[PDB]
Amino acid sequence: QICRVLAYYKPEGELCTRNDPEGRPTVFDRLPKLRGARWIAVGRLDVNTCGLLLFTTDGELANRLMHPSREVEREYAVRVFGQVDDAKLRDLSRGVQLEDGPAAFKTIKFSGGEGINQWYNVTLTEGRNREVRRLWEAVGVQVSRLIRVRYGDIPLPKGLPRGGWTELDLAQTNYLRELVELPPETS
Ligand SMILES: [Cl-]
Ligand SMILES: [Pt+2]
Ligand SMILES: [Pt+2]
Q: By the 8 A CB rule, do 7 and 52 touch? A: yes
Q: Is CATH 3.40.640.10 the right assignment for the domain spanning 1-187?
A: no
Reduce the DSSP state of residue 177 to 3 states and report it: helix
Does residue 46 carry a catalytic annotation?
Answer: yes
User: What is the 11 CA–ligand 3 centroid distance (Å)?
Assistant: 6
Query: What's the rounded Cα separation, in Å, for the pair 182 and 177?
Result: 5
Residue 170: its H or E element = helix 170-178
User: What is the 27 CA–ligand 1 centroid distance (Å)?
Assistant: 16
Query: What's the rounded Cα separation, in Å, for the pair 131 and 100?
Result: 10
- In the set 46, 85, 91, 100, the catalytic residue is 46
Where are the domains positioned within the chain?
A: 1-187
Query: What's the rounded Cα separation, in Å, for the pair 2 and 122?
Result: 35
State the ligand closest to the CA atom of 129.
Answer: 2
Structural biology method used: X-ray
Q: List Cβ<8 Å contacts ≥24 apart for 152-155.
A: 152/68, 152/72, 152/73, 152/74, 152/179, 153/179, 154/7, 154/52, 154/54, 155/52, 155/75
State the ligand closest to the CA atom of 117.
Answer: 1
Residue 132: its H or E element = helix 131-137
In units of Å, what resolution does this entry have? 2.5
Q: By the 8 A CB rule, do 174 and 5 touch? A: no
User: What is the 49 CA–ligand 3 centroid distance (Å)?
Assistant: 7
Q: By the 8 A CB rule, do 164 and 11 touch? A: no
107 Cβ contact list (under 8 Å, min separation 6): 73, 75, 121, 122, 123
